[PDB]
Amino acid sequence: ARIAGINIPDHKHAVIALTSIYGVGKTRSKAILAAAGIAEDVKISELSEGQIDTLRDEVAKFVVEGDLRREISMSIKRLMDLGCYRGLRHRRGLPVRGQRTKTNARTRKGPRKP
Amino acid sequence: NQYYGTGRRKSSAARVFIKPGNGKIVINQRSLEQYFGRETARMVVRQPLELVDMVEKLDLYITVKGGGISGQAGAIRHGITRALMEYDESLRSELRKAGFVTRDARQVERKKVGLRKARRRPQFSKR
Amino acid sequence: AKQSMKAREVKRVALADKYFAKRAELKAIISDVNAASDEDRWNAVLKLQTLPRDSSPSRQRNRCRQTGRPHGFLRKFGLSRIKVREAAMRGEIPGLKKASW
Amino acid sequence: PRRRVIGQRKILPDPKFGSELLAKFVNILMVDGKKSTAESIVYSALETLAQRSGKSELEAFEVALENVRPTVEVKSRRVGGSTYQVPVEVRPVRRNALAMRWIVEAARKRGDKSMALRLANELSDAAENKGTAVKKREDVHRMAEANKAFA
Amino acid sequence: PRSLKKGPFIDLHLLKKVEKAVESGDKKPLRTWSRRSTIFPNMIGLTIAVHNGRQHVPVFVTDEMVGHKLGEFAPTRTYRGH
Amino acid sequence: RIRIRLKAFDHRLIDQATAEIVETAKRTGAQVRGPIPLPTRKERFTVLISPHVNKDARDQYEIRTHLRLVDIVEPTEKTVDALMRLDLAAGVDVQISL
Amino acid sequence: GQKVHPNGIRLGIVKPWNSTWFANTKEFADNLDSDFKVRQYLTKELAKASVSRIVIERPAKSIRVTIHTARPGIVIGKKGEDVEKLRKVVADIAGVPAQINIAEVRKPELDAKLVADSITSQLERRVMFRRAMKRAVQNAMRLGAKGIKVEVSGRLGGAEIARTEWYREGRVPLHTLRADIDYNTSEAHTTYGVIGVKVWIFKGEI
RNA sequence: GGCCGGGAACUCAAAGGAGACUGCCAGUGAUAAACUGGAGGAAGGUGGGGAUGACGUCAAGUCAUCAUGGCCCUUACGACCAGGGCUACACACGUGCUACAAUGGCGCAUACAAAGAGAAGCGACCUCGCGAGAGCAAGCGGACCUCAUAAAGUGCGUCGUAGUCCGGAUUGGAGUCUGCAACUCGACUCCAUGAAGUCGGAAUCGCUAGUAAUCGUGGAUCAGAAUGCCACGGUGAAUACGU
RNA sequence: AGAACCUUACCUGGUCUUGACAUCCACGGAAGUUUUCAGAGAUGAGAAUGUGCCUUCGGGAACCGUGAGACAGGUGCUGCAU
Ligand SMILES: [Mg+2]
Ligand SMILES: [Mg+2]
Ligand SMILES: [Mg+2]
Ligand SMILES: [Mg+2]
Ligand SMILES: [Mg+2]
Ligand SMILES: [Mg+2]
Ligand SMILES: [Mg+2]
Ligand SMILES: [Mg+2]
Ligand SMILES: [Mg+2]
Ligand SMILES: [Mg+2]
Ligand SMILES: [Mg+2]
Ligand SMILES: [Mg+2]
Ligand SMILES: [Mg+2]
Ligand SMILES: [Mg+2]
């Protein structure tokens, strides 16, 4: 139970356990499982090392965990030194996709400062 | 021949034909249990027949459209009551005492201007 | 509305039906996928923007025909809500009476 | 209200057991108009109550209600600037209404896997007078006993 | 954003303004009002004075800022804290 | 056979229109299918009555478009000119099909 | 501003419409706009012709205008040139061949529009407003009316503080839809601004 | 298979009528008005819901719908244009939406509506695309065609009470199409991400039955852009001792 | 009852002053169609080809452009004048 350099949980259905890989949601998880010919509902614990091993290289077709988390950080860093509008929004911790800042925007700005 | 009744309830219109029979009920070319999954819908269309203890003496052929499960069931039971009095006028007194003869005129109150629903007002702030 | 605002709307309608045919076929070239040469589509979008901006139907803000009001407009009557109500109360809109249900 | 005196709305009895009282309890437990969802919950809970008690669904339900039905309640009333709680005898119809409401709120609070399990568990504890609904009825009787000096 | 089938949008006058700019090798800033034109690989190296509402902010086009629009490099609202 | 669809904003006007048109028939051409009522369109409108900032102050109007279909079958080919050439009432729209 | 328009509330019950034609949404707005233009022009030309209501009909690609007036002779003129020139210009602004019928109002003192217009002209001629209102009320009551209400609002007599004076003689039931209430308004453009005149004339029920 | 022939029964449609009026009975009441019950009846008493808002009040709102007195500008306080902004953001309130879950949510299957809108419009079917959508293309100015497969519901599995298979805000890619143009500054889709939040202090709001609560539906505005507004149905409560 | 432009009334800089919208005007001229250069666009400069009125005809137009002016224009203020 060590796909993609992390310990995916046991005792959970393979679809649910597989999504713990950073870069694998439910769509990729069921695509990986179907490509590996493993039923969705089976627990990770009941899998055999052969079944786990075909999982290992099945998710190797997807950029996941560290390398994907590098490119997203590369893509944000990309904007930030570019000096574009999106970069400046990333600099200031403000909403990037044109949401209002007069109210709300708490996810980007955190809790109210005063 | 057939003794017909029309039943209406909450935007539903039922068409009830009764015949002297061994007891069998088809609504919209379906049996009672095929059509009405709801258990309380089961009773409602049975309520007239059980009251007049005529459940097995009659065969019911019913069509209904409009409304929902409870609307159609109540309309069906109202149509059975109408046809039951068509079958035997004397039964009206017991059916009326049970409350089945009256057409249930409760309808969805319209939405009003300035109101979120028929009566629900927007939240009111003093200041 | 100001007289100039009404004049802007009149000119926009005049431009939009003057260039309606040319804009229609230009948008056909860009939209087409099969008979779509990469260069051929490219000149079309370059040509489309050389036409006056007011020839685009989207630049038309329909206004109350009597006042020129740009808000509360009704397509059926060509009037704003204010002019519709007073023409309705005067009985000058056929078949239009106060509703209740 | 001030003038208009209400004729009671009539409730059609429950299908499985044909009980006027039980149909009201489904209404108490109904949320968001989902009477079908509520009907299954109390029908499931009632049959585990039957199996785990020994009597029928109605008898088991009646036993739990009896241990939760209040007899006297307080009401904050006024003479001058008084604000005392005044003990008043509960009318029989309100006794069942209060018992059903107290059972349902207690069942919601006591965390289990399912609401039917929650309802069955609380209904059973009510039968042996250990439930939180029984606790609340004790508090009401205790609160109305303290203020028995007013009438 | 803009459909792939319709290509990139660059307004015609600016497109032919940088045409002669790169053709002549001129390095003077290109004063434009088209904040909505996408950057072309052609314009890499040029300096474009992009309007922001009040001023033409000079942006030195680099290879990295190619798939973007001129306006993204000329913020229109000035804000420095409250 | 040939269908006449009548639509007007006034139901009394449309009833008068249908009454005369089917009695234009039954003399020059008989066997009329009768004026079928057809559902009436209730086009409703809701406008702000105040010039300024009274959102809950609204007038609700409606235009009832009454429809009628006669469906005159078995035409005598001298009922067609009787059905035609009639200019009965303004405010009634007459549609001739087939 | 809390009374429903007396005409509009009765539009289907007792009062008729002033525009009686049919159109689909494609030409409804155009017909409505042209109706406004012909009414606007006609009132402007027949200002001194005592016109009460202008009825518009649009049968089969043609406009039929019925002008209700208390001065049909002045509207028609010598051999009908004025109605004929009206017919020409009504046709060329409505876009369709025109036909101008003329309805004669038997008693101009019983029509709300003409009563309101007469008061408005008096106020613009600096007649003292209470006298104008009393004369209108008395005239209607004596030619036969179950009631009349006249309301005048604005800077009355040039008063710096606008006020509303109204006289009601007889019976004017506005909540009775069966009641036939002739109602109309007019505005006097005095040297001190606009004075609003409202006239209700009750002519029995049914 | 209303699919066909047919039929005019029924539903339904929309016109015209009937019906409900304290009409009848009993009691109370000043022998009155009226009230309380009952019968009958679909409906019992102003059956339900609308529209309908008296004289006036707040110098309440609107000179920015419009009109208008009086002032004020008249190579500008007018007029045209491109670009910005009205969308900012240490904060504070109002009104909402979505949730904090198991009366759930995820999958599969399967029922039952109403009311609307459509001609540069609604746009079947079929093909392509994971999808948003693209082609091609009927039909329909409409009880015909299209929008358009209602969703809660039900049945069977799964989860196992955990910030979780709850929640879906952010934020990265990649895309669609609407329009000259999606950067400021849209809607939608797909993959990835999976925040706050475990029911909310003082305080406070709405609702007396098809009501509240909950579930969907569509349309005005509108090239495009609703969690708002205006309508429509589906399931459907609790309680009113009393002042 | 729906701010990307438009809306839009705001402001930055580009512009015009009988004006964008009217009516009388006085002259010249089909207008209205297709293009090019410059401009960010406004706009300016051009290139063509259009010569239709409908007809007491010669000439009213239906309009297009300059030039005088009356004037137009104002979502400018006062809702405590209406
Ligand atoms: Mg993951
Ligand atoms: Mg409802
Ligand atoms: Mg509101
Ligand atoms: Mg628009
Ligand atoms: Mg206008
Ligand atoms: Mg009344
Ligand atoms: Mg004030
Ligand atoms: Mg103010
Ligand atoms: Mg902007
Ligand atoms: Mg705003
Ligand atoms: Mg329709
Ligand atoms: Mg999650
Ligand atoms: Mg109430
Ligand atoms: Mg602008």
Ligand SMILES: [Mg+2]
């Ligand atoms: Mg703008």
Ligand SMILES: [Mg+2]
């Ligand atoms: Mg401006």
Ligand SMILES: [Mg+2]
């Ligand atoms: Mg100004």
Ligand SMILES: [Mg+2]
């Ligand atoms: Mg005031």
Ligand SMILES: [Mg+2]
């Ligand atoms: Mg006022």
